[PDB]
Amino acid sequence: KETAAAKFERQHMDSSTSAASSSNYCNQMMKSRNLTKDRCKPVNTFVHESLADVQAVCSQKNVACKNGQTNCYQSYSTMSITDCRETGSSKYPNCAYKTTQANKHIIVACEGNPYVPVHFDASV
Numbered sequence: 001k002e003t004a005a006a007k008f009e010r011q012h013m014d015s016s017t018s019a020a021s022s023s024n025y026c027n028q029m030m031k032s033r034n035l036t037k038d039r040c041k042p043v044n045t046f047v048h049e050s051l052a053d054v055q056a057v058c059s060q061k062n063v064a065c066k067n068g069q070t071n072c073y074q075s076y077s078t079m080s081i082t083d084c085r086e087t088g089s090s091k092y093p094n095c096a097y098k099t100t101q102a103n104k105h106i107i108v109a110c111e112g113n114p115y116v117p118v119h120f121d122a123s124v
C-alpha cells in the first residue's frame with residue numbers, strides 16, 4: 001500500500017519542531033506515526049530539518065549502505081535529530097521510549113524521481 005518514500009516520511013520526518021520538545025516527545029510521536037501499531041518498534045530516528053533539506057541529502061556524499069547496496073548518501077551538514085529507544089517497562093500497546101536529542105550527519109538510501117530518501121541507514 002505505502003510507497004517507500006512515503007514510509008520514510010512517516011517514520012523519519014518531523015519538520016514541525018526544531019528539536020524534541022520534551023522527554024515525552026518519543027512516546028507521542030511513535031504512536032502518532034503508527035510505529036506502535038502492531039508492536040512497539042524498538043528504535044527510530046526523527047529528523048527535524050525541512051523536507052527540502054532532507055531530500056537534498058540525496059544529492060550529497062554518496063556512500064555504501066550498511067547492507068552493501070550503493071545508493072546511500074551522507075549529509076554534508078549536521079542535522080537536528082531525535083533518537084527514540086524503547087525502555088524496559090514498555091508493554092504493547094503502552095509503548096515507552098527514551099528521547100535523545102542530537103545534531104548528527106544522517107545517512108539515507110535514495111530512489112525515484114524525484115530522487116528522495118527511502119530508508120534511514122544511520123547517523124554519524
Ligand SMILES: [K+]
Nearest residue numbers: 043044045120
Ligand atoms: K531509525
